[PDB]
Amino acid sequence: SPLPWCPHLVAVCPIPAAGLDVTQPCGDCGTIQENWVCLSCYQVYCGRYINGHMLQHHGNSGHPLVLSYIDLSAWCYYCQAYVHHQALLDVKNIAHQNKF
Ligand SMILES: COc1nc2ccccc2nc1CCC(=O)O
Numbered sequence: 001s002p003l004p005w006c007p008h009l010v011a012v013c014p015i016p017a018a019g020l021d022v023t024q025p026c027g028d029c030g031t032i033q034e035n036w037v038c039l040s041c042y043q044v045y046c047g048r049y050i051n052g053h054m055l056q057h058h059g060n061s062g063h064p065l066v067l068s069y070i071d072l073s074a075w076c077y078y079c080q081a082y083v084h085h086q087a088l089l090d091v092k093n094i095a096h097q098n099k100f
Pocket residue numbers: 036046047048049052054055066075
């Protein structure tokens with residue numbers, strides 16, 4: 001199971017009123033594959049198995065927590081773990097409505 005809390009949930013920012021687009025491509029390479037959205041600034045970048053742009057974004061922003069547009073899991077780069085908590089329910093559900 002994921003961690004039930006982490007000390008970076010404080011950095012999760014309010015969801016844009018535009019909502020989320022789970023088909024949004026990577027902001028850097030344009031791939032449609034394995035994208036994640038950053039839960040601090042809501043930019044979308046690809047996962048480590050494509051071109052690793054979300055990991056790069058973490059490195060040059062320090063933003064902690066990212067949501068997968070594949071399965072709606074949330075990863076913390078600092079804790080190196082999946083996290084789930086009530087603070088993540090609204091953004092997961094917006095993503096779920098857009099995806100399914
Ligand atoms: C299981 O998810 C990850 N494990 C990682 C391990 C080491 C380094 C980065 C990692 N990033 C993710 C998920 C987000 C991503 O793919 O960028």
